[PDB]
């Protein structure tokens, strides 16, 4: 059984900067099992304070083993995937486990308007999850 | 503020449990709020096939929620804690809510008398609960 699904997360007014190092924003829950995304706009910790950290969390309790490959990307103004980062294998998700990237994208890259990744100051993240069971 | 308490549960004739996957045994209730333990001798589900699953259940609560950390261990023949598993952080309990570990210990480990954890065919579990 293969189940692939996605979620698009729009974070408005991203430049507002009301989340300090270690602080988190969580997305609404989604499914194809319930999942959510968690982002640290100023990094998970001191070694990552210069990056957005981004994680996929399994919220619900599965009945059988869940392994998932995941890919996170940023959508530009044309809706195209850019700066994608993909898990190098399927990871085991149990209830309450997250997996992701502590250094998903540089804050100083994302925040510079010229790179075009915050159109109307909106950060749009796209998460694709391929579940095998 | 912390309120920490414990319960010891001895299950006799453990090797004779007829519970199939998904079936459950619950303990008597205890308190320092009423709680009990629940075990699935043959696992909760497919993910936990061939494990004993172990849970803390909040049976009765006068308010909406309780936050608690918990630790389960198996007491060996000397009464010592072994094969412990702990929540690490506090979990949110409401009346009727359980939290625990579906893969608490392999059934085939527990059931082999040679590991010494079923003296006289008795399983002794020890739960420590910290309401924080």
């Amino acid at each position: 059984k293969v189940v692939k699904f996605s979620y698009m997360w729009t974070i408005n007014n991203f430049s507002f900067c009301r989340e300090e190092m270690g602080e988190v924003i969580k997305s609404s829950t989604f499914s194809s099992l319930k999942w959510c995304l968690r982002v640290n706009p100023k990094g998970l910790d001191e070694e990552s304070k210069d990056y957005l950290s981004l994680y996929l969390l399994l919220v619900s309790c599965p009945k059988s083993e869940v392994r998932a490959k995941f890919k996170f990307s940023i959508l530009n103004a044309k809706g195209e995937e850019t700066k994608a980062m993909e898990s190098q294998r399927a990871y085991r998700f149990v209830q309450g486990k997250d997996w992701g990237f502590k250094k998903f994208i540089r804050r100083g890259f994302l925040l510079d308007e010229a790179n075009g990744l915050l159109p109307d100051d909106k950060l749009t993240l796209f998460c694709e999850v391929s579940v095998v069971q | 503020k912390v309120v920490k308490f414990s319960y010891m549960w001895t299950i006799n004739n453990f090797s004779f449990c007829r519970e199939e996957m998904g079936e459950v045994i619950k303990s008597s209730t205890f308190s320092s709020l009423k709680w009990c333990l629940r075990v699935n001798p043959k696992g909760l589900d497919e993910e936990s096939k061939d494990y004993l699953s172990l849970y803390l259940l909040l049976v009765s609560c006068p308010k909406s929620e309780v936050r608690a950390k918990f630790k389960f261990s198996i007491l060996n023949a000397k009464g010592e804690e072994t094969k412990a598993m702990e929540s690490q952080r506090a979990y949110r309990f409401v009346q009727g809510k359980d939290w625990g570990f579906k893969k608490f210990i392999r059934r085939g480990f527990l059931l082999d008398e040679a590991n010494g954890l079923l003296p006289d065919d008795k399983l002794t579990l020890f739960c420590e609960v910290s309401v924080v």
């Binding site: 968690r38 998970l44 950290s53 994680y55 309790c61 149990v94 209830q95 309450g96 486990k97 997250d98 997996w99 992701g100 990237f101 502590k102 | 849970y55 918990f70 598993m85 702990e86 929540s87 690490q88 979990y91 809510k97 359980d98 939290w99 625990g100 570990f101 579906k102």
Partner: peptide, 11 residues
Amino acid sequence: DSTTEGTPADG
């Protein structure tokens, strides 16, 4: 990367 270690509980 994961933000947790140890044993997440289920329920």
